[PDB]
Symmetry: D2
């Protein structure tokens, strides 16, 4: 049986909801097949987000970690292939930090690849009738920061963990004033559950 830690962020910008936390909160305590899921919220703040993730890692001793974030504008569930060593914020984080041209780990690699079997995950989500695709950029805001920090912590200190990041679209209630694509919270939650079960079931990806 594998313990899967999912994280979601609190609302950022002028938002009042973040579908990443709303979806992962629903899966706290869920178990299916080889997966047992636990969820933790991470603040949308550079540096502090990584400290909170490390605390959740110590609390839960997970085998698999899937950090989730919102990518407004996207139309599919998108597991991320690669995290980059760069904080480049177009807007400030929830405490006002707005780093530009900053390394996340000084002397760390330019990038880290995901440790999750994302092609299998994309296919299992599509099998269930929900759109999904691999993404090759997680941005340069707090989501990519958390993804790079997670892979760095895994590489250096906990290599047994299979970890990675999945971005999700807006939910419909976030698109009432400006037209934008969304996926329902029910579908996003289902996709994240499929991701957790798939990662727990397979260490190895397909081609």
């Amino acid at each position: 049986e594998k313990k899967v830690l999912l994280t979601g962020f609190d609302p950022f910008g002028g938002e009042t909801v973040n579908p990443s936390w709303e979806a992962v909160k629903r899966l706290n305590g869920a178990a299916e097949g080889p997966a047992s899921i636990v969820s933790e919220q991470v603040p949308t703040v550079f540096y502090k987000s990584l400290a909170v993730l490390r605390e959740a890692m110590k609390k839960h001793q997970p085998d698999i970690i899937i950090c989730v974030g919102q990518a407004g504008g996207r139309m599919q569930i998108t597991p991320e292939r690669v995290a980059i060593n760069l904080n480049e914020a177009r807007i400030p984080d929830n405490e006002g930090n707005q780093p530009v041209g900053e390394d996340i780990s000084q002397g760390g690699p330019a990038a880290y690849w995901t440790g999750l079997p994302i092609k299998r995950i994309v296919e299992e989500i599509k099998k269930e009738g929900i759109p999904a695709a691999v993404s090759y950029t997680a941005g340069t805001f707090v989501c990519n920061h958390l993804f790079y920090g997670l892979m760095d912590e895994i590489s250096r200190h906990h290599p047994h963990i299979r970890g990675g990041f999945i971005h999700i679209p807006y939910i419909p209630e976030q698109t009432l004033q400006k037209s934008a694509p969304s996926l329902s919270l029910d579908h996003i939650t289902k996709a994240l559950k499929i991701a957790a079960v798939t990662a727990a079931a397979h260490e190895d990806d397909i081609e």
Copy 2:
């Protein structure tokens, strides 16, 4: 005052296997909410025949309100239509091979008909339930606009007391697995159409927002 609301959705088209406009309205057949009593009928995705089928459904049900529904793939909101235009301009053929170009729907009829539904109220009530919606000012020139214009022409000429109009819906997620595109779940689309029926049943007059 109870109002009978006729909803229509289209039969299967475009290489698709599911026409979501029908999947959604079929769920509402026989539904009763607020002052709305809803009945649903399927219309073929065929120029000319679609309007004959609509007229037959109108005769069968004697509706007070009519809301014809079709799919506008690519849109990201539920979009009640403001205006129907007197033109069939098909870039691909319909289910029976008809591909009209530059054709009037009603020869000598008006260039356009405005909707008879309180669409600004419908957009606001859908958004109050957390579902995106907006007024659209073009229903295209394919069978959806054809049905809308035909519906308004039949109301104007033969049953002016009927309040009718058209609403387009986006793709549902299952239609966007091979080529990315925006969608809304069938559950949210069905709920939005139910809201539109109840809103039109409850209010003859639109708001001015």
Copy 3:
């Protein structure tokens, strides 16, 4: 033979410093191209007043063909308009503070007027020159659609011999430096408008 073609473009609108619809049509003022003799006049971005200025330009030039031009930011092609609708629905005010909502342009006038230009021919002749173009079925509900409906209404009621219509153009690149959006160069837009004027002067009939 010769056909007098009146082209219009709009005056500056806030936030902008030059309106490209005018910048392009002004370049064609006095041009003799094929059977077209082109003259250009500027119209204010104001409900009601725009139509009065158009009427004066019609009296002044006695045109045979009238093409009003406006900008539809976000579009990716030159787009001649098929239909004008009898509605002013403004999400922001015009240049003189008018923000009509749910208002008829002509009380008792038809719900719509079709264009009088050979727009399919125009689209094909523009594409023949390597410039993107397509027919549009909505001119919006702001001042552009307003001027289009008013032009067709004035033609129908008072000068039925005139062939009139409306063409929207995209942003120019210089308008897309702070927020990404499609554009076409001022040179390509000017060339497309010249082709439209020549095409309309050479053909009353559409393909």
Copy 4:
């Protein structure tokens, strides 16, 4: 005087024109300020593209290398910040190669950063009225392959050379049958020349 080598791609399937090559060809032999420019064409083929680039580098001994490719759908000139070590092709290249899940360099790093002052380049192009922005993904097709292979060569053999990649949008004549954003070939060419001059004038970014 800095020798700047620009590359553009050969004709690709469906197109009869590769605008990255049409634009850089115009600049072959151009001299402006501190830049002396030369251009070379590379085939849209995995592995062979890198061989042609290495030969061009041997011939010209450039100080600066800017490889250019087309990213249909974008609406700005986009210098790339990062190349990744992966060939993942959804369509075949011009010689039928369709690599899936393959490293570009076995044992090379997951990514390389660009060596060009791309923020300066973006700003100088916008000063001339042309849209531009930094991109953080060059894709996983032949363009990213050429970019990663370039950075691996620089690391490898000539660390002083400053190199990178810039994607350009479609030109209007490629958007007649299916609508899409574009920039004129003259504006793309001017932007690429600004990039070359900016890179030659400045080793450091802003």
